[model samples]
Target: AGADEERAETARLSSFIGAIAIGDLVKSTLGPKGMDKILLSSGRDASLMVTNDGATILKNIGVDNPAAKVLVDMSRVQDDEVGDGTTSVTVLAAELLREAESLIAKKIHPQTIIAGWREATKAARQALLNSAVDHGSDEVKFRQDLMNIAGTTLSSKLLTHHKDHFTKLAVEAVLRLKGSGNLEAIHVIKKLGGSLADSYLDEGFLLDKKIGVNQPKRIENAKILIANTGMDTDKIKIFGSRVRVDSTAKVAEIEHAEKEKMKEKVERILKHGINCFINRQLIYNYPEQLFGAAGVMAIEHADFVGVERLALVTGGEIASTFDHPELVKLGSCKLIEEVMIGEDKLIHFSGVALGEACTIVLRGATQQILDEAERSLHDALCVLAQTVKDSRTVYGGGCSEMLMAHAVTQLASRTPGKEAVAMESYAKALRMLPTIIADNAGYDSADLVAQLRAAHSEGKTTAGLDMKEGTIGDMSVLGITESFQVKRQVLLSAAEAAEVILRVDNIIKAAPR
Candidate 1:
């Protein structure tokens, strides 16, 4: 074959490999039926992680190869925008890419196909938003959805409930349960699945069954809250979601004055009708305020805005219930401990069983996991978020993806000729549609990709659509040099996250490279 032929063939293989890797990353983590990958660090510690969540896996394996890295960026963008659409974005894009490759065989430029693909996909995202079931401001709905959120990850691990660990008693025990409609299925599943599995949960079940300092209390209609106003302390730095308000500098700011400020801060939270306060600084400053405590959790570590979830769970908003300042009630919250498991506390609740009234925390271990965990949670949350700023609809098919796919098929149609590069770009664009749809109302991503290609034609890469972080940022802002706001900021920033993951050598050379 000619030089052009060989280049095309190489690009095709590279793009196809990247697409499949990313597609699988996105595919395996849908609903509760997702899959997992076991990771063994160079040292003796072997971690078993079950997740099809795109960003999680991509960061886990590292997406450094020039080709695979782009998809990683896509996952990063999705993560920042939404707390739960990593897989959707990745799978859709990968699928689109797969399809686009076939179209490329028909003699289409990777750029032309992307242009057409973007137009069609932009409409699809909008359509998805239009179809989404709004959860509204109802905490009940939020709590119930939380189960789905939790279940999405728990289901992968096959967790069960505390009471129904036994097979013979599951059916009858399920009958005598108390919960709104949302908790029913989960309650039953918990009863049936047994303790061997970890998914099944009863309300606020904790990984550990421990009590808190201010136990023996309950607040009826306890309120949940999320705060990032930075009233409690310094502004929090979100390194891709791992949040922190530095209090390490023990220079006294007047404990009494600080106490009053804290009091007022809590008061502001109460304005929202909340009875609990959950945040790294909040918990850290008032560890005694928490009824119970445990290992650290990333979701609990953030100031309560970003990087709230580490692993597969949502590190919720600042949740709090207010009674007399002296009067405490029932509640549970999580905190991050070394980006591994977590440390949680349950206290001040009148009617919460130990561990039964616990907080299920999600944390990402290792610097990389910490960095990406926030994006992962946000992506997942977006998938579950009812908070829609915009919504639209469009067809899954466009002139480009399939056209590109067809083009690739025609080229490779003749067997493994040198048409790899052309085929690969088509494949990449084809798979990106559904993901883009999930990202925006639909049009947002579609238009962005079109623009991305337009810019690429002019020689530059740009973000298409995003949430917390903008669609585009400087490499310094998002890259792996830990350019995030705080050290923890790196945990959720996608800027150079893909590069970080792809460059993992498995061995840390203490000396500079």
Candidate 2:
């Protein structure tokens, strides 16, 4: 710790600061409505951020920044172990560093602070597991919560009185489609919100995904076509790969042509191996036209807002979709959604390579609400997927806050000389957990925590505490997911990753222009 080995020292500092900073940064975007931060890269474009996903932001901008790259990799330790909580792991590391830094400034030993953080964080992990809600018992709540987070609140009035039960069915489709390898994800078109894209599975890989009509056979070695134009007036389209150009006025121009001319063009397209048309732009239709079978597409205006929102789920791969349509649609999108946080919403969409390669386009009616829903959806899926695969432990939002507070308190306590001040902070921090949990669950956390603490002080053995919320009591939501389990074996990996990074030394120059 004496000599200034610039490279080694910078690396160590970078690792610790980066690890902790990355962790804390992503947590802000944990729940619904959390804000996303924009990072101005050293390059031309300002990279946009839609969520507090640590690994994502890290990978996007850190490639050229060595310190950031190390931190980004460390953040990933959580995802590898827990199958979620990259954000949580990052935040915990950062909080630990905050206390460690203060203790360092006060002449407290580094080892002491690190030890305290390690011990405290360990305890917090256990505390977190104690509060996790089981998936099997809380499936309904999962679905309802997902609905609230994913898009609309789906109020009882809107769900039962106004909207049909199809929305519920759509949620079910997602859960059901989760494990098996079957492709075409089906939901009633009306229940399908926003636009046709919302209907298109981010991972449907059939040669001809025209579920609207059954192609007699698979068109192997088929010529694929990218159709940017509106369909012909004959309400008919010939199937094949080669597309006939109708003057190529950016495609949509074909709409203004004579009905006869359009029919001829459609025939020309069919004759080409372009058995299917990949429609890039949306076409508006007279309601009367969509009801018939002759026209394969139920044409309508492009829900640009919905599409853009879904684009966010692509983990910044939205541009890639347009750039490389075939591959992007086949797999990349789900990777993006997988990276985004879905705090409590239930998610269903197709992906080709076992949920890894496929994309799930997420949408929210409003940017504010939708942002929240997307995070919830991300969290819920992580919980659900992990819960079903391995049902060992889980954590509640309240418990998470509580454990975090407790860890921080522990670090504050052992500064040795702080004595009473440390104890006071610890008490305040630990007490925050139950209160937050209770508040989230619609219970009187203040009252419960007060009673519990007083009783504990008085040497009482038993104190009652329960989390009660619409989520726990009413059973209102129909098809939402209430997943709250950790999928991977997290503790070891996260700790080891954090340790390695924190212990690093030296920083090499990435770009010295």
Candidate 3:
């Protein structure tokens, strides 16, 4: 057993400590004033990702500890479920675990801590929902509220400097895609040559692929046929190229037959009365010439994503076969033209059928900046979409945390036994959110929490850290707010993760593969 044998390692409370450590690792990178984590990615690319994104940071860190992997999975679940507030959720889980450590040390069972947290979470959720401001679905009011929500989400990232520009674009794109349930129609095209303010929202689709050689460079009132199949003429054998011609006369006949086959394939597509042909694969010169003669603008080799989006924006289906002419869903646009972006010719689709499709061409100083900006814009977009769905938001600046924390504390007092300690600890964990926010902003976190607690005690329910002012203020008046779903999700995910970690009594490390 001693010779070349695998070993098993185990720990009890150490698992909780290790998991909390992972949370604290990314806690500093929370909120608008949060610092960035410079992650040197692994493998040959070996690039750097300077981000404060909780999911991204955890993903790049490659945490080998089994205990920390629980929180990592929690972060991704939070990201996938809500798309924002990942850092807050992760930090909250860590803080919860930290709070529970004391109760465990006092001989309180994991079951009691979990039970107290469950009740505390329900009460906190009720408090948040009760605190949410619903704007009911009026278009103008919706836009205004969504703008503020997007701004709040973007404020936490590098895009804060250009929040006004990017948030507006995000709001516009999501609102346009509203009621259509086609968020995929909102496409982002990134270019690294210009400043962030230079980024613009195009009213229609902008594909980054060019047209086929010598084809019509532009077409008006265009009819588009979207397909993923190859435009190359099929061989005599469907599976492979195995045609043979022995004599010279037979060779000429075979050549004529091949050209006619190509001509007929082109004619079949042209028979659909489509003036614009967009294929997901290459278009050969012979078919291109036929399309040109038919005055059809043929664009070849469009990426699958772009093609799917094009079909969506145009309110058309991707035609895989031309067998049934009536069934082919031909997409149409008022204009199809090649536009130049940094000397690259790209197809621009305007006046699409749905008229809801749009593109955000993100511009920035460098590729890294552009990449981060893209991520920021994407998060903003997601938050805006959530706002549209719920239309209920709460004051940000840690106001929601203060309210939930107060509610959890009050709920704890009404409860009995050692579980009350767990509930109060949950309140402390909630308050830690604001404490971290103040800490990141370079303010005295203890003082901020004291003032925050006092204001809430005096019934100033909306008072939170006005980070710009370096003191507690009324976020309702300051107009700093966030999506209710985001706040709700943070609490939900963090509590669930904490409960999971709390319930764990053993960390068993097995042999390597």
Candidate 4:
């Protein structure tokens, strides 16, 4: 009886309230016409960010309630796993909890709800597999499908205004880096001066740092050296001892010897027959001056990630020593130039021999908009990469969800007892996606949901909400599609998160640390 006191009631109430509050927070940021959330931080270092990216918004918002943080973590994992559908996961989990609350009030066991949801989840996965579309050994058709999939992923972001332009860019970027599995091969740089329309894909890696001011600013048809070691001359020290320089002549001799040693270090690199030197560590002033006079373009503090990227694209390995100068492989590029981005300057590396690496410089009116566009583009890029990997897709626009919901509900009819009630609630949770999509589009959700079910019942599996017409239409005809992996992940992650939240019925406070 003690377990059923005010504490138990509070636990259930807080979980539901917290989940729903987080759901409502991100619910408006769903769908193609979904609204954006402007998050303003009230911390010491105040900042403002606007995005419809579920992970971004959840990351920025601070939550003290343990129950709400469960939803926050669910969104994060969804984004990490599939690169999209974070909002869908959060909303679905919240809706499932909402259905479970009704069942709980009727004195149904949580375990029964969990069991039915589990059975329905298994059936839903099978339904997805049964209806999946495959592209077998057809590269051309697959590319076209990739383009459509990219467009679907970008449809809800700021890039939607120029969806075609960015979607094609995303497809091209992923295709270039396909089989390489090196996501770093596709670099993203943001510029604020130009409009989003100006964003284009570059067929080479672009370094974010500036070229050394003292060294040559540009190089053409250059053989490049990537080194991780510092370019500064080593300082020699004698433990607890001082040099006895009694004469001015001795002092001059000592200085001359040090200069000659530094020159020898520079000569070792020059013997490699390279014109460009990219170092992961800092190059001191003497080395920079020596390299400049030698007619070699040298960049200092180039960063390891950039150095590795250059090596990958240009066919070189990072050298730590000049011990075997002949065996130290070098990178060759047609041109390296300093370019101006907005008011700032940046070095652009292009025309690498491999030409497999690429860069996307996203331009927009402001930093925040560019950030949102980048996040959106990243999602499209990730989904496109996944599409290329799996070569399978499912219709979007709520068709897949509707198809799976129908299968789950039909399976529930054969289930027995209290589990049947739980399975029915699972069906209700499945409808939440289409229902929210309709509601977000300002349509009568109840009426449209009925129409959607009727269409699905009539064997029109592709029938889904067409926001353009504010009515039910065939998603296949509309070319509304997504990667099968993304759709499958959404269902899997949403069901798993909801099941976990529904299993929780107790919350206890710990002593403050």
Q: Cα RMSD (Å) per model?
A: 18.0, 13.8, 3.4, 3.2
Model 3 bad stretches (over 4 Å): 1-10, 23-25, 42-45, 108-110, 140-147, 180-182, 236-243, 265-274, 292-294, 315-331
- Cα lDDT computed for each candidate against the true fold: 0.33, 0.37, 0.67, 0.68
lDDT of 2 at 84: 50
- The true-versus-predicted C-alpha distance at residue 300 of model 4, in Å, is 1.4
- Candidate 2 overall lDDT versus native: 0.37
On the 0 to 100 scale, the lDDT of residue 109 in model 2 is 40
TM-score of 3: 0.89
Cα lDDT of model 4 by residue, 1-513, tens digit:
233322554666776787777767567667665677776767642566777677776775565645566457565555555667325666776777776557657585677668855775676568666776544635534546344656555656656776557776776666577665655666786677776575867767777564457667677877777776666654547443456767888789867865775676577667765567777878756766777776677777888877777777787854756442335666676788777877577777888878777788877775666677766766766666666676777667777778777877876666877777777777767797888777777888888788888887777777878777687887877666666666666667767666665566665555444
Deviation in Å, model 2, residue 178 alpha carbon: 6.0
Clashing pairs for predicted structure model 3, backbone only: none
TM-score of each: 0.37, 0.45, 0.89, 0.90
Candidate 1 local lDDT, 1-513, one digit each (tens) = 221222454555555577576555355444323444555555444564444354555665552534465446454544444434224444544444455446556565544443433333333332233322222423323322232223323232222132112211222222223233222211111111112342222334232222232432333444333333322344347534444445745335445556665566445444534444333343334433422221111123333222232111322333343332222322223321111122234222222322222232332223333322332333333333212222211111121222233333333323233344433443444435423422432235555455434432332222222222323222222211110111111212321332233223232213222
Clashes of each: 132, 48, 0, 0
Ranking by lDDT: 4, 3, 2, 1
lDDT tens digits by residue: candidate 2, 1-513: 333344543455555556545443454444321235655555555444344444555655655343556555654545434335323444444444444344445464443334533544454455455543434535433634234212211221112222223223334445544554332232221111354232233452212123233322223222223333434233446644346775677556545555444444445444442222333455323311322322322213322332332232222122232232232232222211111222332223223233222334443334532443343344334333443445443333333343344444555445455443433233343453344334434556557565544443432222223332322211222222222333223333444555555454453443444
Candidate 1 Cα lDDT to native: 0.33
lDDT tens string, model 3, 1-513?
Answer: 222222212343554566567655566766666666666646743677777465766664555634566557655655555667435766676666665446646674668567765775676568664766544557735546444556655656666676556776666666677785745667886775665466867767888665556666688877777766656655535665565657677778766866875666666666666577777888766777677777677778877777777777776654765442224665675798888866566778888767667787776665775678756766766666677776677777888788777777877766776767767777777887788778777888889999888887766767878777787888777666666676777767666666665565543454554
Best by TM-score: 4
